[model samples]
Each structure stands twice: as C-alpha cells, then as structure tokens.
Target: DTVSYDTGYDNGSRSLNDVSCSDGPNGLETRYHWSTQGQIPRFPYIGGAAAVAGWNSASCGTCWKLQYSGHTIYVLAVDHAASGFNIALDAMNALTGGQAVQLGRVSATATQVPVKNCGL
Candidate 1:
C-alpha cells in the first residue's frame, strides 16, 4: 500500500506508550503528558518524545495536532524513554482517559504545533 503524507504536518507512522512523568527542575507532569476535551477542547496531543525512539533534542517540548476518527487534539513532546517501539506517543495517561483506543497503532500525521505563551 502506498502511504500518502499530506496533512500539512510532519506526517508519519507511530504507535503509543505510557511513561512516568518528568518531575525535573522545570516541573513537568500530566500537563505535558495528557489532555482532553474539557481541558484542551481538542482531541489532544501527547508527548511524542515518549513514543519516538531516538533522542532528538529538537523534539523536546514540541507540540503537535493530531486527528483520527473525526477527532483532533494537540500534544507536546515532554519526555522519551529507552525502548524499541518504532514510534510512540504518551497514550492513555490519567489525563486523556484512553482517547487513543480508537486510533491505536495507526498511520498518523504530526504537524508542528505552535503554542504561544505569555512567558514565550
């Protein structure tokens, strides 16, 4: 099958995973791991670093808007783990409430989402 990439994002193939929150000096946690309709009003994006294998320093804190099954959400790449998962995203954390179930291990697109914060 020929895969098409035309979602206006860095579309790619990926899976999902759950990892411990990074309680580092920056105070990162579920806020970076999970989100839902109430909290974000979007399908919610998750930490792509937690899912993608290699450590691309560029991926840290990277946000993306993903859509599947008529749903879309945004997420940030908080942390990545040491594993052999081709492409993984922090899926189904306490925050998201298993929102990824419908699109488990499917072909997806990752658009470089931009977040404008007062601090930025």
Candidate 2:
C-alpha cells in the first residue's frame, strides 16, 4: 500500500551496471509487471534481476533512462537486489541478446519517468 507517483525525483545522479540472464535464470524468468493503482513491481526471480532498493522500490514502474558511452536504454526496477552496487540494473540476456557484455560497466543518469509496464 506504499507507492508514489511523483516524478520529481528526476536526479541525474546514479550509477549503473549490466546483469544478464547469465547472472542466473531464476529472476530472468520472473514476470515484471505491476498494478497501476497502488503497489510496486513484483519480482519473483533471483540473482541479478533488474531490481532496486526499498527506496527505489517506492517508485516502482519507473522507467530509468540510462546511457552508456554511446548506447542508450530505458530500464525499470522490477525487483530488489540482494547485494552489489547501489543501482544494479539487470540487462537481461534475452533482452540484450548477449550484447550486455558490450554494455559492461555503464555510467548512468537515473531519471524517474511514469510507466505502465516494465516490458519484461
């Protein structure tokens, strides 16, 4: 019952990393979807799956536009990360088509954007 729709948290300060299904197949198979009324994105997967902390979870269904070098992509916090960097975005292998390696360590600017679905 805790969800916020305020997009003012558009701070251009945040770090990002690539996590492929290779990190694991558990979380990769999870369905990334949420309710538009009152709730956060549910992640039933494990390992490195595009997830965020409780603070970030507060703004679920938020699309974070990330740019790495010359590559740009929009990602969502569909789950919660256990450990690692502050922002560990899972660039799912299936979605990245193994190009995630090309992404490697990415420098990102996190901006909250309203979104209906995370497109998992």
Candidate 3:
C-alpha cells in the first residue's frame, strides 16, 4: 500500500496508551516491543510502527513488509488512519534514503508479514 509518515507520534512524553493499539491484546508500547523486550531507549523515530487504514483490534501488533524506491522495511500495526498508511517518520526516511523531507509521501507495496519480521 502507498504510504506517508507522521512525526507527531514518535518517542517523547507521549503515554504508551496514546497509541490506539497499545491497550488491548496484541497491543504494543514501543516501536520494536518484542525485540527490545519492552526496554527503554525505544528506537526513537526509527523504530518501525504504522497506522494502517481500515485496521481494527484484530490488526494490532501485526507486521507489514513495505517496499518503496528500492528499499524495503517492516513495520508493526499500532494505530489507525483514514487511508493507506501513516508510517513513522524515520521509517519513511529509511525508505526514501533520507529523502523523506523532499518526498513527503511515496507510493509503495505492502504485504502482511510475521510479527518477527519487525525484529527478534
């Protein structure tokens, strides 16, 4: 699916529950929740997370493999969007080779993947 990025949701004073998916089963608090074992120093904005459109409770914590501009990334489903994906900023930067500033949004293909695809 084509995607965009948002800087507003990265690490900071934000509560874990601020993310819609962080409250229930299959919920996640940090970017790489399982990889980091819920440790601090969450991967800043680069930690992979995505707000996918049309997602519901069942979609929480699911992983997606995104391919764009010759780059591929995996992100976890952590929130909701009106359409497509609103991905984390650093993930977009990685996809665009740090050109996210020049390309606010990009077209990409996405596939549902195993949660382990996000990390260990």
Candidate 4:
C-alpha cells in the first residue's frame, strides 16, 4: 500500500521504535500509551519553534499524533512533554472544538475508527 508520512526529521521510513507516540513526559506510563485519547492543541497556526513552545505549555487531552511508527496517528489524554520520543507536532491534524472529539474517542465510539474488537 501507499502512504504519505513526513515528520520534518527524515524522508525515510521510521518504525514504532524510531519515534515516540504518547503525549507526555510520562512515557508508556501515561494512560494514552496503553489506549487513551490524545488532545488537540489550544492555539492553531503555530509553526516551527512556536509550535513546540505551544506543546511545552499544552494541557492534557486529545491530540492527533504519530505513535510508535511515526505514522501520524490520532492520540488522546496527553499530559506533559518528555524526551527520547522525539516529539513533534508536524503542525498538521489541528482539529478544533467538537471536531477534535469527532476524531478521537468519538470516532472510535461511533464506529468511525474501528480496530479489531472496539465495538460497543
């Protein structure tokens, strides 16, 4: 299959170990790593270092992020930032309001983003 993925770090293929997924300084200990929802950034249009600054002060919630594979996936329940994960926003998938919810658990709950047995 064909896919589009770029993290401003490399134009090459990166695996789950190549990058970090969860949104926090807590690593896998964070609820999102297991299966929590990432949060959306508060400010939009932030680019470059400015965006990184935004993340530095960002709150816990839902966010569209690249997990282990750096595949630009949707994440939620984020907290603080940490090292070793090579965290980067990519400045994309900046959803707003109900839109963020629509992309997160809502999508999963509504059957929009089904996994193997997430149906309820």
Candidate 5:
C-alpha cells in the first residue's frame, strides 16, 4: 500500500466577483456515521474538496477507468458547489484497498466530498 499526501474548498454568500467568502474549514463538515472503529474526517480549509478528492494525477475517471475492480462507494451531501468544488465520499457503503490507490486524481472523490471535517 502506497501512502498518499492529502491536501485542498467551496464558497458561498458573497459578491459575484469575490463569492463573499471562500468556504473555509469551519464553513462545512462531513461526518462518517459508519465505522466508529476506523473513521476518517474530511479535510479542512478552502479547496477542501480538492484536498480530499482532487488527485495528484488525473481525474477519478482515468484512475479507476480500468485495470481495477470489485468495490463501490456512496455520498451523503454537498452544497451546489458555490465554488466549483464537489465533495466526493460520504457514507462509503463497501470500501477496499485497490479502490483507493487506483484513484490517481479522484482519490477521495467519493470519500471526502465538500471536504470540511478537519477533525480526523
């Protein structure tokens, strides 16, 4: 298993040119109500979504396009992407190893959408 460096937000209620305020850490939150034994919170700060889902390589589609299989994911919620961002992961029905490593870009696409649960 290779280690991955997680890093990146949304915006709402602002001006048309500035977005009022960049969705910072305290602005959003995603709770993992599944495995209390092993739960990981979303990233905190602007571009949090990118920090969680934004891959270092390519978009999620290409990473998991092929060459891998046997898994699934789920989502909980997300704003209208007031800042052109989208939190991916939410509830994660049945997760595994291969599913994550394969995510060259969309690593946390379905695992950290909106990315704002910095308290992990």
Candidate 6:
C-alpha cells in the first residue's frame, strides 16, 4: 500500500531508550552502517534502517521497498514510530535524489520484502 514517510538519522538511537525492535545499539549500528553505503539509481537499493509505525518486535529486521518519484529504496526495520515511517538519512536522500531538505516529507508505495532483499 502507499504510505507516507520521513527521514531520521537518529531514529534507531532514539529506539534504544524504548523497546527497540533492533534489539540494541549494536543492531541499530549494523543496519545504519550498511545504510550509509547503500547505492541508489544504479543498484536501486538502500540497506539503511527504518522505523515503521504500529510495528511490533517481530517487525525488527524486516525489509521494505519504498517507491517514490520513480526511485526505489530498501530499508530494514529497526524501530517503531507513532506515525508514518522514519527512515535513515541515506535512504531518504536516495529516494529524493538528494533533495531531502527541499522535501521534508514524502509519500511512497511501501512494499514488504524479505530481509535478504534489503542486502543485509
């Protein structure tokens, strides 16, 4: 289904104080590290992390494919949010083609994928 999402570099960190689905800081870091190196356009995938709204512990480590403006980005779930989804910085940039600042929030077609599809 189509869903709205935002970008947050510290979403995972913020999860640490709560019930983070990623387990802990190390898990968050693992996903964040991969996210920074994710490629866009060419590869069309971002191993970055994300926080989905209304998600539970079982949602952790799951993958999602977000299609926006003809671009597609893949991110792993590491935390939970109140509304929409909070994705990593790199993934946001990739989706917006580096115009994340200009577009604070965006709508995308969200699709669940296997964790392996996230490249982690």
User: Local error of candidate 5 at 43, Å?
Assistant: 10
In the range 78-112, model 3's lDDT, one tens digit per residue, is 66766667776777888889998788888889888
Q: Which residues of candidate 1, in runs, are more than 4 Å off?
A: 1-45, 50-56, 81-103, 117-120
Query: Regarding lDDT, does 5 or 6 come out ahead?
Result: 6
Candidate 4 per-residue lDDT over residues 18-97, each given as its tens digit: 22333355332243343312222222211121112333233333233332222234433223323212222332333223
How far is 59's C-alpha from truth in model 6 (Å)?
A: 0.6
Between prediction 1 and prediction 2, which has the larger TM-score?
Answer: 1
Q: What TM-score, computed on C-alpha atoms, does each candidate reach?
A: 0.39, 0.36, 0.74, 0.19, 0.21, 0.61
**Model 2 over residues 1-120: C-alpha lDDT tens digits?**
111111111222211112222122232222332222112232211122134543334433345554444544455543444532123223322223344445443344444555543443
User: What global local distance difference test value does model 1 have?
Assistant: 0.34
The candidate maximizing lDDT is 3
| Candidate lDDT (C-alpha), each | 0.34, 0.32, 0.62, 0.26, 0.25, 0.53
Q: Considering summed lDDT, which 10 consecutive residues are worst modelled in model 1? A: 1-10
Model 5: per-residue Cα lDDT over 58-81, one tens digit each: 222111111113543332222222
Better of 3 and 4 by lDDT: 3
Count of backbone collisions within predicted model 5: 18
Report the error of model 3 at residue 76, Å.
0.9
- The residue ranges of model 2 lying beyond 4 angstroms of the native Cα positions read 1-51, 82-99, 116-120
Which residue pairs show collisions in model 3?
1-110
Residue 88 alpha-carbon offset, candidate 1, angstroms: 10
Candidate 2 deviation (Cα RMSD): 13.6
Cα-lDDT of candidate 5: 0.25
